[PDB]
């Protein structure tokens, strides 16, 4: 009685595979074969933020495109003003081992977490004048790899326990859980509408989740190893994934197929972070070879190289206005590029 | 307001100078073998923070990278271990840690524990590791077995050392355990500095 369900699964797989093969009109490289090549992108370092003692693991800008928070495993959360290079805030953390940090859209709250299996939310606008720990979200059975704010009262987190969670901050409870991944969820990217979000895990697959229903809409495969980074396209109809197989892959949602692959023979290191530009034609990706590559997302030809770090690049920082990029590294320095 | 920003920056920088001076005077150890468990101790006025990584799901290839810059990894192994070959599992874990590009400079303090268990056991180690029948010490049974395991670990370690890191094996009481961790960390720092001066 179990073989008929086995071949039920087989029929579903074959139907989906053939329906995907049917929507194979042409390759992205074909329709994009008559566009103007971007050319050599020559960016220079404009600011060098120093002050962190240990390697930096994550950074997030904030909707103002001026301030930015950075997390360093020396146990520090530093909020800098990128214009003047001054340190606006310095927050000591309970656990030294942090992996992610988030800036709230309102600028009033900051969030961090890591191997402590907890998401700490600190308040920045206090009549006391000192930053306090406003909340501590607990319930994950694995390390936190990424967290992102929806508003001042909701936050989405991804953990090493192969699960994602939506948290209400006031009550401190877990409203919705997202399961289905078979490996560590390493990254998550919120869509501009805040209704959907994609997540990449160590099982070499990405998943699209709807926030208001708690169910996986689509699954995307094609990478050969773990997915470390994932970023949404500005319009929200596609995304990009960086993996340990030394390639980046652009997937589409309405097509349900992989659209493009960015790779080179002389690149044999993994991708640690990805981010699009305001227009979305430049795909910036940090690598373990201490450099960052700027790909032409439409032509797949490497257009630029940012080489100013002496250690592993860990995070990328395109702003909301698209004026500058921020790169953090294991050398304990942050760099602003224009 | 720019003057206020400068004043806030000056205050934050004084605090950060204090924090930097306090951060360099501490040594972080990774114990291997609610998300993390800390243990702070002090030997000869030198402070040590050891971290036991529990509450994880036995897939280490991602969260291990967080310890790229610790002073040492304390690797605890049971000399004695439906009985599975756990010694080979420990050997494979040690080999994977020794050859990880993000840990190629970290020295490992090996602790061979449960020697009384192995002692009462010797009178089952040869069904695995068929080379035990020819190995010779460099009762005699427990010495043979423990030194054979130590030599297996050292054989794994001395194949890719590159001179940048070493292994410090001990047979195992917290007194001499802590004293040994202290002495091995001292030796690790000394060897790093000596290699930097083209002396080792």
């Amino acid at each position, epitope marked *: 009685e179990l073989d008929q369900l086995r071949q039920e699964a087989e029929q579903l797989k074959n139907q989906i595979r053939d329906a995907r093969k049917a929507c194979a009109d042409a390759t992205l490289s074909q329709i994009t074969n008559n566009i103007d090549p971007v050319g050599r992108i020559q960016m220079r370092t404009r600011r060098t933020l120093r002050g962190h003692l240990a390697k930096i693991y994550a950074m997030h800008w904030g909707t103002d495109s001026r301030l930015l928070v950075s997390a360093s495993q020396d146990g520090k959360l530093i909020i800098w003003d990128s214009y003047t290079t001054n340190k606006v805030h310095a927050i000591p953390l309970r656990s030294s081992w942090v992996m992610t940090c988030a800036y709230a859209p309102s600028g009033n709250y900051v969030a961090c977490g890591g191997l402590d299996n907890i998401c700490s939310i600190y308040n920045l606008k206090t009549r006391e004048g000192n930053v306090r720990v406003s909340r501590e979200l607990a319930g994950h059975t694995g390390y936190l790899s990424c967290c992102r704010f929806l508003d001042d009262n909701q936050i989405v987190t991804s953990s090493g326990d192969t699960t994602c969670a939506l948290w209400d901050i006031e009550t401190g409870q877990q409203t919705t859980t997202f399961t289905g991944h078979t490996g560590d969820v390493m990254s998550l990217s919120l869509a501009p509408d805040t209704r959907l979000f994609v997540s990449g895990a160590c099982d070499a697959s990405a998943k699209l989740w709807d926030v208001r229903e708690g169910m996986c809409r689509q699954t995307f495969t094609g990478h050969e190893s*773990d997915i470390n980074a994932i970023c949404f396209f500005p319009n929200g109809n596609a995304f990009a994934t960086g993996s340990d197989d030394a390639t980046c892959r652009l997937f589409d949602l309405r097509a349900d197929q992989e659209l493009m692959t960015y790779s080179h023979d002389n690149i044999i290191c993994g991708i640690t972070s990805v981010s699009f530009s305001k227009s979305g034609r430049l795909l910036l990706a940090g690598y373990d070879d201490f450099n960052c590559n700027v790909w032409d997302a439409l032509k797949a030809d490497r257009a630029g190289v940012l080489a100013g770090h002496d250690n592993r690049v860990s995070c990328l920082g395109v702003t909301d206005d698209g004026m500058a990029v921020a790169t953090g590294s294991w050398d304990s320095f942050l760099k602003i590029w224009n | 307001e720019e003057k206020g920003q400068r004043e806030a920056n000056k205050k934050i920088e004084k605090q950060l100078q204090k924090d930097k001076q306090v951060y360099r005077a501490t040594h972080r150890l990774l114990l291997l073998g609610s998300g993390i468990f800390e243990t702070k101790f002090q030997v000869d006025k030198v402070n040590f923070h050891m971290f036991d990584v529990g509450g994880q799901r036995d897939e280490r290839r991602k969260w291990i990278q967080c310890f790229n810059d610790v002073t040492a990894i304390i690797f605890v192994v049971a000399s004695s271990s439906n009985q599975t070959n756990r010694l080979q599992e420990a050997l494979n874990l040690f080999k994977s840690i020794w050859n990880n590009r993000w840990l190629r400079t970290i020295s490992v303090i090996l602790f061979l524990n449960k020697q009384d268990l192995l002692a009462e056991k010797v009178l089952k180690i040869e069904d695995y590791f068929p080379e035990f029948a020819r190995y010779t010490t460099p009762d005699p049974r427990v010495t043979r077995a423990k030194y054979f395991i130590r030599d297996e670990f050292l054989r794994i370690s001395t194949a890719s050392g590159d001179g940048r890191h070493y292994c410090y094996p001990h047979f195992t009481v917290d007194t001499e355990n802590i004293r040994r961790v202290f002495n091995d960390c001292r030796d690790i720092i000394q060897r790093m500095h000596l290699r930097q001066y083209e002396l080792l």
Partner: nanobody
Framework: QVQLQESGGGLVQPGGSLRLSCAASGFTFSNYKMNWVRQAPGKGLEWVSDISQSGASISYTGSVKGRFTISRDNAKNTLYLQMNSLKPEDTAVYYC?????????????????????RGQGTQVTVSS
């Protein structure tokens, strides 16, 4: 999708011979280090053997040294385990595992009980 299909397992009297074949798909077979793992009744996953990218470096577990032979055919993207002089202690499910990342000497988590790059495995039973 990454797929590893094992085949060639069955029943065999003690002291017989078998040849397990693992067919890989969905990745560049040559850039990865391959492993054979096994799980016996009422036991955990135990690493058996491993072979490197080129096929020069080979490693076995002491329990099978002199009996098992690992082979890699990169033209056909196939792994082979030739077992000779099988004992009743080899009855188990054998899995064909791939290291997580390419171009690396370290192989993490191939026996994690939920590894993603491991196949379904084949049964082997040595008895009368």
């Amino acid at each position: 999708q990454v797929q590893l299909q094992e085949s060639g397992g069955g029943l065999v009297q003690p002291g017989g011979s078998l040849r397990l074949s693992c067919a890989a798909s969905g990745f560049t077979f040559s850039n990865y280090k391959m492993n054979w793992v096994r799980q016996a009744p009422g036991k955990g996953l135990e690493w058996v053997s491993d072979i490197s990218q080129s096929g020069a470096s080979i490693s076995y577990t002491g329990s099978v040294k002199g009996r098992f032979t690992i082979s890699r055919d990169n033209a056909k993207n196939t792994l082979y385990l030739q077992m000779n002089s099988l004992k009743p202690e080899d009855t188990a499910v054998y899995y064909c595992a791939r290291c997580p990342a390419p171009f690396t000497r370290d192989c993490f988590d191939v026996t994690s009980t939920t590894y993603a790059y491991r196949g379904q495995g084949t049964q082997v039973t040595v008895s009368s």
